[PDB]
Amino acid sequence: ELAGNAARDNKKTRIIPRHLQLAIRNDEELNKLLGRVTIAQGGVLPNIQAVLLPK
C-alpha cells in the first residue's frame, strides 16, 4: 500500500526498490520494525539539516 502510494507520487507505474525504501522510512511503525534493515539500492530519504541552508 505505502509503496504504491509512493510510486504514484513519483508518476511511476512500476514499484522499484527506491519506492520501497521511501515507503519504509516515511512510516514510523514500519521504520521502527525495520530499523536495522538495509534495502539494497534504496538510497536514503532526502534530508538537509536546516542550519546548512543559506540564511
Partner DNA sequence: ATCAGAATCCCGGTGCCGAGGCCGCTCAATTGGTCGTAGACAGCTCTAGCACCGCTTAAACGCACGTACGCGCTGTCCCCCGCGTTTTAACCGCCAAGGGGATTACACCCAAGACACCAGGCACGAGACAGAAAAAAACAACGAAAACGGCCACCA
Partner DNA sequence: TGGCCGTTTTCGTTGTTTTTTTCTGTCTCGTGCCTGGTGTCTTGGGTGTAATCCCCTTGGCGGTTAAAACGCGGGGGACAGCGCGTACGTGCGTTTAAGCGGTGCTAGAGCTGTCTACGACCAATTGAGCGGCCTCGGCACCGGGATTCTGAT
Query: Closest distance between other proteins and the C-beta of residue 51, in Å?
Result: 6
- Could you tell which of DNA, other proteins, none binds residue 42, using a CB distance below 5 to 8 A set by kind? other proteins
Instruction: Determine the 3-state secondary structure of 28 from DSSP.
Output: helix
What's the length of the chain?
55
Per-residue string for binding with DNA, 1-40, x by CB under 7 A? -----------xxx-x------------------------
Instruction: Determine the 3-state secondary structure of 33 from DSSP.
Output: helix
- Cell numbers 507520487 label which residue? 9
- Cell numbers 520494525 label which residue? 33
Binding site for DNA (CB under 7 A): 12-14, 16, 54
